[PDB]
């Protein structure tokens, strides 16, 4: 479902900008990986209905862009952390040129909610932790390669607006 980059487009891009584009690996030998973590069911927060739609669309898109997509659902922040550590260690990243990480859940200002989150006992994965686990130390195989993080979550409970008269 993705509009393709033609031979004319690709070289025009390779002309407009000289040595400032991320290199892409040969189609037949590259092993691109992406990971979707989607929390839909929660202990103390309402079910995220419609989430299956988000899962479907993002899996289809990333597969069509050349990524092998893994999908993990309904996880605590500890599970998410374990899963991201495993993802960072995947040897396929050595023969990849890039990665996508997609998180979809309830969220608050601090970060993304695990399945057990409540105001009483927080279950939160911080964006800081996500960056740490995919950095050059913890994920050397993706050194110098673009790492794209997409987050569908609230970042607090404000409507995000201010009123003015007229």
């Amino acid at each position: 479902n993705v509009k393709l980059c033609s031979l004319e487009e690709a070289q025009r891009i390779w002309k407009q900008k000289s040595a400032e584009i991320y290199p892409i690996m040969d189609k037949s030998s590259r092993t691109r990986l992406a990971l979707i973590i989607c929390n839909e069911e929660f202990d103390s927060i309402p079910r995220r209905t419609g989430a299956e739609v988000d899962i479907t669309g993002m899996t289809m898109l990333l597969q069509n862009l050349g990524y092998s997509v893994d999908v993990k659902k309904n996880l605590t922040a500890s599970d998410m952390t374990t899963e991201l550590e495993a993802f960072a260690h995947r040897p396929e990243h050595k023969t990849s040129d890039s990665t996508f990480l997609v998180f979809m859940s309830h969220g608050i200002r601090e970060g993304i909610c695990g399945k057990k989150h409540s105001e009483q006992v927080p279950d939160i994965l911080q964006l800081n932790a996500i960056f740490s686990m995919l950095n050059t130390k913890n994920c050397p195989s993706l050194k110098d390669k673009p790492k794209v993080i997409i987050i569908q979550a609230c970042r607090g409970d404000s409507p995000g607006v201010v009123w003015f008269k007229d």
Binding site: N1, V2, K3, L4, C5, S6, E9, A10, I13, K17, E20, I21, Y22, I24, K27, R48, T49, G50, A51, V53, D54, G57, M58, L61, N64, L65, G66, S98, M104, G107, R109, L127, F131, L134, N135, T136, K137, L142, K143, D144, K145, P146, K147, V148, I149, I150, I151, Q152, A153, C154, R155, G156, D157, S158, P159, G160, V161
Partner: protein, 88 residues
């Protein structure tokens, strides 16, 4: 013999709203940010780098409708343009 590497480089994050604020999800149609992102990626992956695609996504939210939200790009250390070259 050891060599230095930057601890954090070549990241971009794209969140569904601004800090403090809500993101919206239709119970049957899915999340507006996710849907909008998919549509822009389908259209512009061929001609734009991901940073430009993300800006176009934000532009599409500019008018605060009934359920206003403003996607935000975060903690960007992309040193080059990331083009997906779909079809290659």
């Amino acid at each position: 013999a050891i060599k230095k590497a930057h601890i954090e480089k070549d990241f971009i994050a794209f969140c569904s709203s601004t800090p403090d604020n809500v993101s919206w999800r239709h119970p049957t149609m899915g999340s507006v940010f996710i849907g909008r992102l998919i549509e822009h990626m389908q259209e512009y992956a061929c001609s734009c780098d991901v940073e430009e695609i993300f800006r176009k996504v934000r532009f599409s939210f500019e008018q605060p409708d009934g359920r206003a939200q403003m996607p935000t790009t975060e903690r960007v250390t992309l040193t080059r343009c990331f083009y997906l070259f779909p079809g290659h």
